[PDB]
Symmetry: D2
């Protein structure tokens, strides 16, 4: 009954189940978790692996010796459990030095520091076997219009990513980058605010093939955007390297609810898309167990993430396998959407009097699309009412 | 006192001052305007030119002879007034045949019809001297998840734009395309919903150099996005071919208020950016005089569009010329943002102990950015309080 | 399998299934429906009754004789089918004369006309047996700040409703009023924009007992508000006289999707609340079959409204009857929320050293609320995964 | 040139200029401020007074002796500066014990503790001379639907406020309560989310005359609502006891920008309303100097709050005094909006054939409202372009 196994490729950030519950208006409600205990508890729940920021694993300002002891304890817990580390990232947002950004801070010496902090963790990530390195520029942005010339900032952002690309290729590392967009919070506006802006930016990098996106359900929904649509565009471009799964109730602060909470029907269409397109990357949960919860609630919340994915996967598969749904898809001409508009070419199109001069516009206009019957079949399948 | 001349390059769509005031809940409050009268009235107000959809100028379903008479009357009014036609577009949204889209309609015969309708108006646009051809895919999208496979739809969208690009190059036309994004309305979600998604899509076209964006103030703000930031990214990519100016009060239906209404400070930063970057295209107003207004209100509203642009232009120029502002920009290190992070290169950066090993993180963290003083200087300039 | 009967009290506006599909950017896609056919088709689907604006039933500007013939045909179809008319309303928004409002139009003669148009339809509503009379002030509002002094407008709004209350009581009519809030569209901002503002306004009327609210799912969600929470406040105040059910995907134009579409989990909690509180009024659907649909799609969409209500009703009832859920509610102390804080009174509270001086704040802080386990049980029940 | 004096009644919370810059993703960027220094610095800037939560002034868990020393130091600084304390409030949100609320926490013993903590600070507030006591229920709410029965929670909320009302009247205190609404953050949804919901709730209290609202600019704008409209409804009801001034850029996390930032035109219409209605309460700024700023930026930001109010006050006064504006107000029939619709009464209205039978609907429909000319005059005045 919806039990995960490591083959389902579910992963969690250390910072997720480890969130102590400090928010802008309140103190922590839970004690800190040792990374080692987190790995053990997640392995017992059926997770495939964990992810980390450098500063989750190695307390900021550790000596090189303390650093090695922290990595050794962590590696021992990975070996003890079979857990993998498919993704790593850099914390370029917590420390006060990053208050105006890392890669696009106005101060040049902060920008250089941000690059050196990132490069050091890329080495560690490769050693632990990470395949994707995520960059979330949470502090890259502004609260006021004059504080940031955005063209210069984009120059600085491109420079930083180009330099990281030169570093990995000069080291022969097999790692790819994924940019994680967010429209706002903690800055008033964040640069590269959506999947689309990030995809557009990547095409201006020196080595675009090394970069993709790491979209997050809740972040696109903070702009009121359709998350499955954005994921479809990222797949279409070949750029879906990683994904952050969670829940969000509309346009407000980033809630990071467990996956399946928030917009349930969007979660259904997302799972349908990922499974139909054969996405094979990690199913990563970037979520926060609400600060109302004790530690038993934390693990119930993490378990719920995986459970909801598996239930939705079953319902989406039943939806697509149902002969009556396959018939309704043809009734709505989804098969025709997949056929070329003009494989015959431009000149044939221009000579085709059935496409314009003799096109029966009123007859085509009268045909219903039958979309509502199709959508009610999808509802019936989601609710198990079929 | 803020009087426009044709050198200011202000343009208006025929559909703007010609909007009869029909909304989803009410009938028209104004009679229709003859395109010829609109050209004359706008010329008297100081406008530079007009834009049109095919169906604004030529009633849908006109014979070829009636078509020629409509164009002739229009051309005579352009010659009488000196008005230019810098942009044209296709109406692929009003007629019922486009209820599920034009370029991405599920029905293949509608998609072919949409292409032939567009190609016919490209010819007319070139004859009238338009330099930019805008495409707003207002019906390309969905209300439900199963109605549209977005990867197939993007295939169909790319196919359509590739075919238009083949047509203009095979005809030797000097015209470029601009895609106008909108997140929603009249479809529940529209494909290519923001500037960013449109920029990303263009990079997958066969001839990307022929395509740019036509962002609209209100459309990006319907996603809660920062419009000057999005414009900066479009300029950075070299893709700002055209712009739609209006006003919008936040995340709600597309209001199309006169420019300067809605988010006043965003309008100030937009004008500052366009004028500082040397944007030389038309300043096009895509706005709707509210249906409360009679015809005297329509022309007062159109006049207000141009007036507000000119006032904001004056205030932005005073802001940037003020020595105390130039000093505050240096205090906030905007000059350092414009300098390369690591022109010395990757190896020099890696060897630079001042960038990491000996970087004084606490000292850099203590420096204030002085952004609030800078933003209050900008406020004082906007309000004429200096 | 989820079949409605008239005992379920499902009702539909004539304007819902009768929506021709005209939106701000397109012409009608469906022919008009005769009110008589609509009554017959809805009766066959299992509906309990219909609602109407005066202008849905009687074409605007009909002579008194044509008026009587229209009512007679309608009454004959009600008798033929057994359909009831539980609610009626006035169209104070379509005709151009209402472009600046009805009850709060700046022009006094329009305000008087709006009152006479309303009073005439109250008579008709009582004759057809309506118990609730709805007022949706769709044009009461403004696009700009100086156009409407809101204190004077609220004076005019109170005056209008006070006069309607005097009319019904002087006629001895057994009818109550329900105000339907909406935050925006078609005006830039609408007066009484949410359930809360409407409830507050009612308490200033001369006869508050005659007035309640008619909240609509999508309207509260256009402000990002929690619709079940708002309904709970209306029930708490004793003011839920009527309800408009539909679906909405977040903060954007009013979509009026079929009920169950949009925010599915909000629909579940709404049905749970209405059924648990014993709401006995009509379950009224104010929805628009998308303009992609032909007439077969219209009736499939209407059927889906009722189906989704019945499925959600079953799942909510199973949720509340599940012993493991009843246990989890006690684990989360929902039983304690229902017990008075200080039935012992103020002085006992002040003397109770266990409430402050000797309260163990750290122990109380450590208790988890177990909300995530509870919410996953609700998810499992909604998805039929239990 | 726009210099404040204590007669302008500008006040600041200790928590505003004292915000250390900790947000959900970062550590503090500024050291803590001694309340005494804050009073001195604000007095030098021209402020009239300060406000406080109990826990801003007295560190949580202080002994009764340390408590007295903290109050004594504070009182000495008030006497040294002439600063007043017009408002006080309780912190029922920071400590982990309040993670599920104070007055509406599911645990009864937490609810009793919350009441005793509040009552203790009411005594202190009266001793310092506060006239208004604010309650912001930031933790009263839920992230999930089953966690909170809202009808029971409203029962508990009413019980708490009724008990506070009994306490102040039994002590003979001259203090009034103001409820501060917020739609969300830090809870997923907060009870009483807008001005309207709060006004409606007050009317169910035992002693409604003791309670009013403390609206905050940014909070109503987090629901996309028109803040001047909401303030007008609160004034109309006689319930505007206090106000929180700041800035907010649309629907997103609560930014608490300095007043004048965010929606500039809304700030203009707000100042016009407050000054025209003769609001005489404090002009309180609940704002956060951005964490990019050092202490010089903090005081520049606080100074900007007062400056922007004074500039807007000047522009609104010029707008209302301009004869051409007074003429345009009559052209738009604002004078008619202020006149009764039917002072002649119901029977006269029903007998008046000019109101319906002989009303010229087409003539009334043709009259333009001239709202756009009026709004451009307001724009010209705001920008100093007249
Ligand atoms: O960059 C990795 C992560 O960093 C932070 O935790 C962000 O909140 C999250 O969105 C991001 O994915
Ligand atoms: O495509 C040209 C225009 O068409 C329609 O009028 C749209 O509303 C507008 O946004 C667009 O710019
Ligand atoms: O007033 C009755 C109805 O009128 C209009 O159709 C509105 O769109 C709807 O919201 C309202 O309920
Ligand atoms: O209750 C007083 C204050 O408490 C908190 O600081 C809130 O953020 C603010 O909105 C409120 O006004
Ligand atoms: Mg997030
Ligand atoms: Mg996130
Ligand atoms: Mg993330
Ligand atoms: Mg628009
Ligand atoms: Mg537009
Ligand atoms: Mg446009
Ligand atoms: Mg609606
Ligand atoms: Mg509605
Ligand atoms: Mg309705
Ligand atoms: Mg706030
Ligand atoms: Mg606040
Ligand atoms: Mg506040």
């Amino acid at each position: 009954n919806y039990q995960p196994t490591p083959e389902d490729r579910f992963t969690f950030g250390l910072w997720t189940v480890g969130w102590q519950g400090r928010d802008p208006f309140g103190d922590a409600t839970r004690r800190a978790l040792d990374p080692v205990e987190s790995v053990r508890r997640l392995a017992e729940l059926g997770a495939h692996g964990v992810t980390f920021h450098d500063d989750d694993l190695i307390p900021f300002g550790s000596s090189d010796s303390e650093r090695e002891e922290h990595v050794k304890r962590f590696r021992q817990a990975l070996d003890d459990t079979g857990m993998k580390v498919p993704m790593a990232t850099t914390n370029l947002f917590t420390h006060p030095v990053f208050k105006d950004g890392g890669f696009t801070a106005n101060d040049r010496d902060v920008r250089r520091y941000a690059l050196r902090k990132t490069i050091r963790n890329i080495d560690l990530a490769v050693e632990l076997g990470a395949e994707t390195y995520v960059a979330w520029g949470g502090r890259e942005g502004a609260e006021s219009g004059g504080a940031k010339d955005v063209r210069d900032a984009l120059d600085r952002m491109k420079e930083a990513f180009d330099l990281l690309g030169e570093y990995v290729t000069s080291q022969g590392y097999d790692i790819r980058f994924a940019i994680e967009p967010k429209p706002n919070e903690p800055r008033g506006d964040i640069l590269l605010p959506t999947v689309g802006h990030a995809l557009a930016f990547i095409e201006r990098l020196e080595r675009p093939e090394l970069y993709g996106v790491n979209p997050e359900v809740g972040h696109e929904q903070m702009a009121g955007l359709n998350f499955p649509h954005g994921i479809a565009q990222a797949l279409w471009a070949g750029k879906l390297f990683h994904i952050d799964l969670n829940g969000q109730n509309g346009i407000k602060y980033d809630q990071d609810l467990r996956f399946g909470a928030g917009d349930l029907r969007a979660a259904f269409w997302l799972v349908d898309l990922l499974e139909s397109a054969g996405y094979s990357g990690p199913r990563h949960f970037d979520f926060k167990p609400p600060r109302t919860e004790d530690f038993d609630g934390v693990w119930a919340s993490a378990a719920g993430c995986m459970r909801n994915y598996l239930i939705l996967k079953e319902r989406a598969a039943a939806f697509r396998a149902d002969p009556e749904v396959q018939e309704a898809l043809r009734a709505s001409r989804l098969d025709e959407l997949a056929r070329p508009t003009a494989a015959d070419g431009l000149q044939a199109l221009l000579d085709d009097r059935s496409a314009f001069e003799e096109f029966d516009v009123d007859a085509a206009a009268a045909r219903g699309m039958a979309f509502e019957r199709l959508d009610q079949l999808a509802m019936d399948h989601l609710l198990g009412a079929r």
